[PDB]
């Protein structure tokens, strides 16, 4: 009786095509939740083309780094660090 989990494997373009909100360094996304959530997906971008993400997914892990408690701009750094791919672990429900 709680969410279910998925993996998003994204290749960087000229970005990943999605936005995040919340976390400890910023304003929450949900009433009583300092987690890092997907605020929106860019139509036509890398992420929309993969169809793996979804507005409202909690981000738990970015390339192995547990961000359930990380500051907003720390994950922002993790999401834009030059690397061939970005693996995301996500919670949906």
């Amino acid at each position: 009786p709680l969410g279910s989990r998925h993996v998003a494997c994204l290749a960087r373009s000229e970005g990943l095509g999605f936005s995040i909100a919340g976390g400890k360094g910023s304003t929450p996304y949900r009433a009583g939740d300092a987690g890092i959530f997907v605020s929106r997906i860019a139509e036509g971008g890398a992420a929309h083309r993969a169809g793996t993400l979804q507005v409202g997914d909690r981000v738990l892990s970015i390339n192995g780094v547990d961000v359930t408690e990380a500051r907003h701009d720390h994950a922002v750094s993790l999401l834009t660090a030059a690397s061939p791919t970005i693996a995301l672990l996500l919670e949906r429900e």
Binding site: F18, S26, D73, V76
Partner: peptide, 6 residues
């Protein structure tokens, strides 16, 4: 800025 785009 509340969201960040990546």
């Amino acid at each position: 800025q509340s969201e960040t785009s990546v």
